Design a protein around this ligand. Structure first.
Ligand SMILES: O[C@@H]1[C@@H](O)[C@H](O[C@@H]2CO[C@@H](O)[C@H](O)[C@H]2O)OC[C@H]1O
Ligand SMILES: O[C@@H]1[C@@H](O)[C@H](O[C@@H]2CO[C@@H](O)[C@H](O)[C@H]2O)OC[C@H]1O
Length: 301
């Protein structure tokens, strides 16, 4: 097996995943495809900071749990997304700084991971901490203003919180090997690995489009981060115009790297994409397969 994306990836030790939006689970066409094709689920919004801790010190896991439970009941594993981020913060957290803010970061990591303890295959512990200004440096958030070690502390906290889970750093525009952002992250992870900061994996969101095109040095990137001693994962894949060439290229990149755990596409049908107008996923609004679907399946087989 062979007939579906997740099974085919499973033949070679990997997964094929999707993002799930709880708001679409009452649509049987959505859940039929989702349930059938994928063996990994990420929650598109329901584990973001403002969804799990909207009030200081009180957690809310309902929408979270509805996605966690749907995935488990239909035989998939789960990726957690995401524990520490500059964006999607509640106002209470947005208002803090320095060590108060750092302490809220640690408490947030512990509350959320504690709730799903032992039930999450991978966690995006830190998401999108690097600038888009071409410098290669960190972003200038409230989190950075507590001190440069915030990322390190995030990972150490997360490790204590749930020893069972792989810990990922996750970002976008880090797929092109020659670009400054990529090299900034590569440099950071290498520093971490030299000093024993517990980072298990790196997540390449892999949003390909006109402002950040696919480039065949994606393979080089994956290989290079792998040699540092971490797993790599494609976490939010989508491709503007869904060319079959390019969907097969990305897939074979992952299949060439043995520390590449798997592929997640960011949505089930074109109509469920953050960029629906770009029709960048593997199923049409109909529910019918697109041409890229077959190319991904052949590469997997
Ligand atoms: O932000 C990043 C872009 O700056 C990067 O741009 C590519 C770099 O090399 C150029 O010769 C390519 O044409 C250009 O598209 O691509 C990735 C993106 O994340
Ligand atoms: O929940 C949705 C997010 O998953 C989505 O995230 C997108 C990821 O790529 C970024 O470059 C896009 O700008 C970003 O929007 O965004 C919409 C949100 O509802």
């Amino acid at each position: 097996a062979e007939s579906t994306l997740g099974a085919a990836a499973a033949q070679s030790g990997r997964y094929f995943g999707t993002a799930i939006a709880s708001g679409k689970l009452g649509d049987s066409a959505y859940t039929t495809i989702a349930s059938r094709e994928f063996n990994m689920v990420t929650a598109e919004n329901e584990m973001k900071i403002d969804a799990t801790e909207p009030q200081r010190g009180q957690f809310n896991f309902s929408a979270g749990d509805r996605v966690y439970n749907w995935a488990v009941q239909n035989g998939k594993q789960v990726r957690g997304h995401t524990l520490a981020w500059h964006s999607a913060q509640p106002g209470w957290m947005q208002s803090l700084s320095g060590s108060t803010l750092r302490q809220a970061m640690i408490d947030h990591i512990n509350g959320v991971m504690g709730h799903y303890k032992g039930k999450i295959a991978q966690w995006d512990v830190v998401n999108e901490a690097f600038s888009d200004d071409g410098s290669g440096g960190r972003r200038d958030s409230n989190l950075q203003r507590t001190g440069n070690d915030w990322i390190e502390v995030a990972f150490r906290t997360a490790r204590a919180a749930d020893p069972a889970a792989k810990l990922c750093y996750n970002d976008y525009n880090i797929e092109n090997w020659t670009w400054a952002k990529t090299q900034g992250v590569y440099n950071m992870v290498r520093d971490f690995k030299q000093r024993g900061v517990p980072i298990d994996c790196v997540g390449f969101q892999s949003h390909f489009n006109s402002g950040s095109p696919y480039n065949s040095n994606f393979r080089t990137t994956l290989q290079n981060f792998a040699a540092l001693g971490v797993d790599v994962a494609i976490t939010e894949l989508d491709i503007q115009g869904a060319s079959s060439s390019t969907y097969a290229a990305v897939t074979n990149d992952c299949l060439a790297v043995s520390r590449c755990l798997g592929i997640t596409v960011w949505g089930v049908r074109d109509t469920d994409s953050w960029a629906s107008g770009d029709t960048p996923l593997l199923f049409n609004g109909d529910g019918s397969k697109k041409a890229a679907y077959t190319a991904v399946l052949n590469a997997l087989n």
